Design a protein around this ligand. Structure first.
Ligand SMILES: Nc1ncnc2c1ncn2[C@@H]1O[C@H](COS(=O)(=O)NC(=O)CCC(=O)c2ccccc2C(=O)O)[C@@H](O)[C@H]1O
Ligand SMILES: [Mg+2]
Length: 443
């Protein structure tokens, strides 16, 4: 099922059924007409400050009502938007930004700290400024996460809409269903929610950060990482969810089973920044695979490495005004993910770069993590290399359901001797595996 847009999707739904509810901003509901009016106030505000088609704009901000509206207004001006996790350090950004062809910075909750960029403010002005709707126009620049410095993957509107199209051919999402903006707009996971909302013309909820169960009040849908869903199940929170899309890492069968117990229908996904989110997906079924590729997507394994094509692929990485192609000599994106293919379903083994050797035997931490995650009391589990006089050896860093449990015996009929953790630790108060290696070495 495809959706052909006459105009900006929000204006499209205004024309088709403007008086229907579109969005919750905290306790405030807006219909499509009201939403468009609010976007216009801002869009024109940005046009007055000199934002034009193709302007590079940094949006350093958390998920808030104000951030969402700023996104829709910037896009409506035809601006190339780079959303930025506010946690990223000042020095890092100074290295990135001059290559990203930006002339603007919008930092709504604080301060612009880049004199090279024109400080952009939130200004509500008449009347209705908007560029011409063009699917193939560059839409978003999204930062990767760490083989060094993060790259800026660039997507068109068409690619984001293609992402939503594929995902919604699997996940039912009715016109009165309400998806919680539950993940950052500076990641593709959060952007994907916005676009699935707009593709279906259903409802989205934006709430200020607060406990997730309260954020979810009246929502039918959400996109979550495993830890988030774990938090809901442990607390046994009263949530009314028709569907959860999971992704970002491997998804344990026991999470998914515990979700069904509590009336939460789960979908499992394999997605990447380079592909504007989900590529392979399925309804959860107790198996370890991540399902088949969605409509309009190809996967293949060469040398145990996952190679991808999709209509949701980025145009390229942005390098000082040029778009660097993502694909290799044969027109595929090489993910650096190790994976297998059986019955047309993909299994993700782990990241190539996370592989490490211990006494000659290769350890793939995700493989080991998957086994340990079977235990009922396990909540998080990371297998980290530590140096040894062996080369390296595996250490388990954990988070348990309620207080530690010793698994050094339980594991013996489940892991090879060389995969069993030397030490069993606790996670200190997406987690970077480099930071995780550095923390373990210092213990
Ligand atoms: N199901 C898996 N098993 C095992 N490794 C996996 C993996 N899904 C990713 N990954 C890993 O994450 C990498 C991609 O990392 S990434 O560039 O930051 N992009 C993402 O993680 C996007 C995730 C995402 O978009 C998402 C997250 C939560 C809920 C929904 C969504 C969504 O809308 O698709 C992949 O290359 C894999 O290594
Ligand atoms: Mg409008």
């Amino acid at each position: 099922s495809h959706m052909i847009f006459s105009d900006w999707p929000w204006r499209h739904w205004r024309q088709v059924r403007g008086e229907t509810i579109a969005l919750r901003l905290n306790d405030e509901q807006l219909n499509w007409r009201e939403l468009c009016a609010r976007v216009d106030e801002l869009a024109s505000g940005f046009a007055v400050q000199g934002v034009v088609e193709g302007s590079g704009v940094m949006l350093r901000a958390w998920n808030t009502p104000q951030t969402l509206l700023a996104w829709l207004a910037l896009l409506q001006c035809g601006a190339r938007v780079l959303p930025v996790n506010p946690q990223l350090p000042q020095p890092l950004l100074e290295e990135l930004l001059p290559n990203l062809t930006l002339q603007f910075a919008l930092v709504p909750d604080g301060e612009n700290t880049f004199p090279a960029l024109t400080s952009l403010h939130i200004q509500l002005v008449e009347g209705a400024h908007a560029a011409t709707w063009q699917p193939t126009r560059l839409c978003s620049m999204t930062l990767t996460s760490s083989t060094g410095l993060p790259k800026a993957a660039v997507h068109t509107y068409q690619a984001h809409l293609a992402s939503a199209q594929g995902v919604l051919s699997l996940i039912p999402f009715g016109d009165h269903d309400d998806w919680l903006l539950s993940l950052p707009l500076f990641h593709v996971s959060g952007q994907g929610i916005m676009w699935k909302w707009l593709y279906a013309g259903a409802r989205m909820t934006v709430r200020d950060k607060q406990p997730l169960e309260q954020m979810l009040a009246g929502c039918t849908h959400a996109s979550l990482v495993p830890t988030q869903l774990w938090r809901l199940l442990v607390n046994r929170s009263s949530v009314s969810l028709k569907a959860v899309l999971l992704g970002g890492a491997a998804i344990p069968v026991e999470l998914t089973e515990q979700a069904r117990e509590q009336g939460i229908r789960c979908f499992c996904g394999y997605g990447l920044t380079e592909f504007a989110s989900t590529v392979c997906a399925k309804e959860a079924d107790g198996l370890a695979d991540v399902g088949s590729p969605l409509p309009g997507r190809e996967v293949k394994i060469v040398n145990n490495e996952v190679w991808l094509r999709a209509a949701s692929m980025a145009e390229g990485y942005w390098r000082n005004g040029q778009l660097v192609s993502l694909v290799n000599d044969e027109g595929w994106y090489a993910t650096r993910d190790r994976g297998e293919m059986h019955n047309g379903k993909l299994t993700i083994v782990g990241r190539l770069d996370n592989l490490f050797f211990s006494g000659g035997e290769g350890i793939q931490p995700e493989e080991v993590e998957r086994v340990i995650a079977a235990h009922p009391a396990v909540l998080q589990v990371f297998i980290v290399p530590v140096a040894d006089k062996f080369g390296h050896r595996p250490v388990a860093v954990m988070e348990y359901d309620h207080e530690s449990v010793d698994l050094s015996e339980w594991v013996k009929d489940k892991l090879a001797r060389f995969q069993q953790p030397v030490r069993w630790l606790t996670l200190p108060p997406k987690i970077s595996r480099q930071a995780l290696k550095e923390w373990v070495q210092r213990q």
